[PDB]
């Protein structure tokens, strides 16, 4: 039975425990403030906690200050006793969705506190007050939440219903803007034979997403490109026929279905390309490439490729400059040979090409931050030795 | 580095471990050697039995491209014998500038690059056993078997050595 | 009888070995800090060095 | 990066060591570590130093006691530390000037001209007993503070000599 140990969520880094003490010092019983500066780099977890010696003053500070702006951002102060159990249970923030984009946790809290004290209330209230029209609202427990479900599912609130029946993903104010009856990501079927007509784009396709609009796409050249736009019902059926009707047979020919003009509600195509670039971006070399910094300016890809011609099959010689002007030190030759790159670790590391030495290391923007971590380490170390020096120097 | 039985230096790689260079500093001894920032200082004697001949030159070598840097000659100080540069030590913060000191103590704060810039601090006292350094750059430690130190420099600090973090500082 | 000398990098101590068996640490100008042995017997010490963490 | 000193002297010498260097700023206190790392076949100037102190504040303290006074023609350059994501940090270019005023130093230059645009490297040709050589390279962090200082006054008349782009 804790007196008070209270959740304070949706913070901003200006709010210190000095400012929380300045807020909650006329409440009456200030015990402590656990600011959740998580131990990566003192970052908030999205929240913090305030502990009070008084249970009543804690209940007071909740019911007075729930989405009130502490230093300009609304305070999401709730209960979190069952919240580590919601962490190691998976439960917690349920999807009372289609919320209002102009109503925050305070107004809807005081509205549906007749449905209960919302122990995990959030709307999409980022951006210093703007809700996107949904969020993760969840009450005390299953009974009060189910009372709110069976009591209010589809009612009116400033001309908007809610949806907790399905786990509705984001963009819900603009859900009907996505559902507008004109725009839709079609399906380009590539290399179509001329036998397929507007009738034929509706025959086997209306089951995989209903079709009224079926357009045999001729181009501005008179012919067919071989690419025809299949106009299903929803972008999920664009998903269903890009990854189910891929090189399929409509009658006898291919269905290479790509996504004609993606509307961004299904996404992440070729983002693995990103991770394919993670084969060669920060883990740069794969023991192949050479980040050779500190050439001469006369050393272009000309003289870099000239030096690395004995060092294997040159595949990418490339020096970034001030908009193809001033390089500030660095080039790259992606090889095709790892052992000639080891020969360069011998030779072309610690190498004058023209007059100024080559500098060889694997190329990453990753551990710049780890180097800054080491800078923090050495900074606190010299602070410590200076503290000992000024202490014992008398 | 391998300062060897006959005043010579076999220098090797701890990593590749192929022999690359058998430099020959002296013929008899190698006594005072330091390796700092690809620069090498050594003085040992080179004369066998009637010698008194700790070599009157600072033999200077580099790790850069296997070259004998021009050996700075070491004077005989004030005495009439040989030079005797048996204590040659590069500075900690200045890993090319060194201090050279004899058996009696004719020590000199001396550049590597310009041997003209010598600071020939004489020793108006007894000959030495050993001497040590100053990471704070301003501490002479002459030490014999007498346990009586003295620093000669200008009085930049009231401090002795470098740092001030003792785990039982004045009170266990 | 003093036969080996070094410093420590983190205090004002001196690290000396005599010809008795021992190894000692020393305060500023005339004061000792400790004198221990890590030595079996006979003479004390060939040599002494400092380190990140202690005295070898 | 580089919360500490990292005090970066460039435009170096072949065969002048860090001896007189350490002789001059001896009485300042914090002199942590001074080093020019090197190549292997190289007894000529290469172009990076490390006059490292403890923190950045010791570098600014070394500036604020006395900095940029002429001895041995060299003036100690400031921390840059700027590698292959800096293709154009101090390489986003500079106004190159013909006919600077022949009394233009660097210290009073940035002193009066800290108002509009922050000068990174006033690579100014000053030689032969206080004379800017007409051509100079006033250099910035961008090419925007450059245009700010030009459109304010691309030079002005104190003995009449407007400066050049």
Curated annotation (Swiss-Prot), chain C:
Written domain comment of the UniProt record: Contains a pseudo-UCH domain. This ubiquitin C-terminal hydrolase (UCH)-like or ubiquitin specific protease (USP)-like domain is predicted to be catalytically inactive because it lacks the active site catalytic triad characteristic of thiol proteases, with residues at the equivalent structural positions that are incompatible with catalysis, and it cannot bind ubiquitin. It functions as a structural scaffold for intra- and intermolecular interactions in the complex. The linker, or PAN3 interaction domain (PID), between the WD40 repeats and the pseudo-UCH domain mediates interaction with PAN3.
What is the protein's known function?
Catalytic subunit of the poly(A)-nuclease (PAN) deadenylation complex, one of two cytoplasmic mRNA deadenylases involved in mRNA turnover. PAN specifically shortens poly(A) tails of RNA and the activity is stimulated by poly(A)-binding protein PAB1. PAN deadenylation is followed by rapid degradation of the shortened mRNA tails by the CCR4-NOT complex. Deadenylated mRNAs are then degraded by two alternative mechanisms, namely exosome-mediated 3'-5' exonucleolytic degradation, or deadenylation-dependent mRNA decaping by DCP1-DCP2 and subsequent 5'-3' exonucleolytic degradation by XRN1.
The record's similarity note reads: Belongs to the peptidase C19 family. PAN2 subfamily.
Q: State which stretch of the full-length protein is shown.
A: 31 to 86 of 1115
Subcellular location(s) per record = Cytoplasm
User: Could you tell me which species this protein originates from?
Assistant: Saccharomyces cerevisiae (strain ATCC 204508 / S288c)
State how it assembles. Forms a heterotrimer with an asymmetric homodimer of the regulatory subunit PAN3 to form the poly(A)-nuclease (PAN) deadenylation complex.
What else the UniProt entry mentions is: Present with 1510 molecules/cell in log phase SD medium.
Q: What is this protein called?
A: PAN2-PAN3 deadenylation complex catalytic subunit PAN2
- According to the record, where are the WD repeats? 1-36
Residues spanning the signal sequence: none
From Swiss-Prot, chain D:
**What are the protein's GO molecular function terms?**
molecular condensate scaffold activity; mRNA 3'-UTR binding; mRNA binding; poly(A) binding; poly(U) RNA binding; promoter-specific chromatin binding; ribonuclease inhibitor activity
Q: What role is this protein assigned?
A: Binds the poly(A) tail of mRNA. Appears to be an important mediator of the multiple roles of the poly(A) tail in mRNA biogenesis, stability and translation. In the nucleus, interacts with the nuclear cleavage factor IA (CFIA), which is required for both mRNA cleavage and polyadenylation. Is also required for efficient mRNA export to the cytoplasm. Acts in concert with a poly(A)-specific nuclease (PAN) to affect poly(A) tail shortening, which may occur concomitantly with either nucleocytoplasmic mRNA transport or translational initiation.
How the protein assembles, per its UniProt entry? Binds to poly(A) mRNA to form a periodic structure with a packing density of one molecule per 25 adenylate residues. Interacts with the nuclear export factor CRM1 and with the importin SXM1. Interacts with RNA15, a component of the cleavage factor IA (CFIA) complex. Interacts with translation initiation factor eIF4G (TIF4631 or TIF4632) and release factor eRF3 (SUP35). Interacts with the PAB-dependent poly(A)-nuclease (PAN) complex regulatory subunit PAN3. Interacts with ARF1, DCP1, PBP1, the Hsp70 chaperone SSA1, and TPA1. Interacts with PAT1 in an RNA-dependent manner.
Entry domain remark: RNA recognition motifs (RRMs) 1 and 2 bind specifically to the poly(A) tail, whereas RRMs 3 and 4 bind non-specifically to polypyrimidine RNAs and may serve to bind to a different part of the messenger or to other RNAs. RRM 2 also mediates interaction with eIF-4G.
Miscellaneous comment in the UniProt entry for this protein:
Present with 198000 molecules/cell in log phase SD medium.
Q: Which family does it belong to?
A: Belongs to the polyadenylate-binding protein type-1 family.
**What phylogenetic lineage does the species belong to?**
Eukaryota, Fungi, Dikarya, Ascomycota, Saccharomycotina
Q: Name one GO cellular component term.
A: cytoplasm
Q: What GO terms describe the biological role, i.e. biological process, of this protein?
A: mRNA 3'-end processing; mRNA transport; regulation of nuclear-transcribed mRNA poly(A) tail shortening; regulation of translational initiation
Query: What results from changing residue 115 to A?
Result: In PAB1-148; greatly reduces poly(A)-dependent translation and moderately reduces stimulation of cap-dependent translation in vitro
Keywords tagged on the record = Acetylation, Cytoplasm, Isopeptide bond, Methylation, mRNA processing, mRNA transport, Nucleus, Phosphoprotein, Repeat, RNA-binding, Translation regulation, Transport, Ubl conjugation
Residue numbers of Omega-N-methylarginine PTMs: 74
Protein name per Swiss-Prot or TrEMBL: Polyadenylate-binding protein, cytoplasmic and nuclear
Source species, please? Saccharomyces cerevisiae (strain ATCC 204508 / S288c)
List localization entries.
Cytoplasm; Nucleus
Q: Taking every annotated instance into account, which residue ranges of this chain make up the domain RRM? A: 5-83, 93-165
Protein's gene? PAB1
């Amino acid at each position: 039975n804790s007196s008070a140990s209270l959740y304070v969520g949706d913070l901003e880094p200006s709010v210190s425990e000095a400012h929380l003490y300045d807020i909650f010092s006329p409440i009456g019983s200030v015990s402590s403030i656990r600011v959740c500066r998580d131990a990566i780099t003192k970052t908030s977890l999205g929240y913090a906690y305030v502990n009070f010696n008084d249970h009543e003053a804690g209940r007071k500070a909740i019911e007075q200050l729930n989405y009130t702006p502490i230093k300009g951002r609304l305070c999401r102060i709730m209960w979190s006793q069952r919240d580590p159990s919601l962490r190691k249970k998976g439960s917690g923030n349920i999807f009372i969705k289609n919320l209002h984009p102009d109503i925050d946790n305070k107004a809807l809290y005081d509205t549906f506190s007749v449905f209960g004290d919302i122990l995990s209330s959030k709307i999409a209230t980022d951006e210093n007050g703007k809700s996107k029209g949904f969020g993760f609202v969840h009450f005390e427990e299953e009974g009060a939440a189910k009372e709110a479900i069976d009591a209010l599912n589809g009612m009116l609130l400033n001309g908007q219903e809610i949806y907790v029946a399905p786990h509705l993903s984001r963009k819900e104010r603009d859900s009907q803007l996505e559902e507008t009856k004109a725009h839709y990501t079609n399906l380009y079927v590539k290399n179509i034979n001329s036998e397929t007509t507007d009738e034929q784009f509706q025959e086997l396709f209306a089951k995989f997403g209903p079709i009224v609009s079926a357009s045999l796409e001729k181009d501005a050249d008179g012919k067919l490109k071989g690419f025809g736009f299949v106009n299903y019902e929803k972008h999920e059926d664009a998903v269903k026929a890009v990854e189910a009707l891929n090189d399929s047979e409509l009658n006898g020919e291919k269905l290479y279905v790509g996504r004609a003009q993606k509307k961004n509600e299904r996404m992440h195509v070729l983002k693995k390309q990103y991770e394919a670039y993670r084969l060669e971006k920060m883990a740069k070399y794969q023991g192949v490439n050479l980040f050779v910094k500190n050439l001469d300016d006369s050393v272009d890809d000309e003289k870099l490729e000239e030096e690395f011609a004995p060092y294997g099959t040159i595949t990418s010689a490339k020096v970034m400059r001030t908009e193809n002007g001033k390089s500030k030190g660095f080039g790259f030759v992606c090889f095709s040979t790892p052992e000639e790159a080891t020969k360069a670790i011998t030779e072309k590391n610690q190498q004058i090409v023209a007059g100024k030495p080559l500098y060889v290391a694997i190329a990453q923007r990753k551990d710049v931050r780890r180097s800054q971590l080491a800078q923090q380490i050495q900074a606190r170390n010299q602070m410590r030795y200076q503290q000992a020096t000024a202490a014992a120097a008398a | 580095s391998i300062g060897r039985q006959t005043g010579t230096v076999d220098l090797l790689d701890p990593t590749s471990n192929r022999t690359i260079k058998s430099f020959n500093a002296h013929s008899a001894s190698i006594s005072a050697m330091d390796l700092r920032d690809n620069t090498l200082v050594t003085v040992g004697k080179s004369k066998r039995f009637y010698n008194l001949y700790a070599d009157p030159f600072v033999n200077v070598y580099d790790l850069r491209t296997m070259r004998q840097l021009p050996p700075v000659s070491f004077s005989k100080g004030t005495t009439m014998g040989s030079g005797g540069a048996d204590f040659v030590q590069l500075h900690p913060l200045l890993p090319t500038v060194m201090i050279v000191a004899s058996s009696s103590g004719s020590f000199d704060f001396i550049d590597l690059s310009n041997p003209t810039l010598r600071t020939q601090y004489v020793h108006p006292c007894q000959s030495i056993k050993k001497l040590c350094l100053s990471p704070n750059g301003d501490v002479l430690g002459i030490l014999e078997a007498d346990n009586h130190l003295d620093t000669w420099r200008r009085s930049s600090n009231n401090m002795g050595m470098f740092t001030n973090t003792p785990e039982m500082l004045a009170y266990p | 009888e003093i036969t080996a000398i070094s410093f420590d990098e983190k205090a004002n101590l001196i690290w000396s070995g005599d010809s008795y068996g021992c190894i000692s640490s020393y305060d500023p100008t005339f004061q000792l800090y400790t004198r221990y042995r890590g030595h079996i017997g006979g003479n004390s010490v060939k040599d002494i060095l400092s380190h990140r963490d202690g005295i070898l």
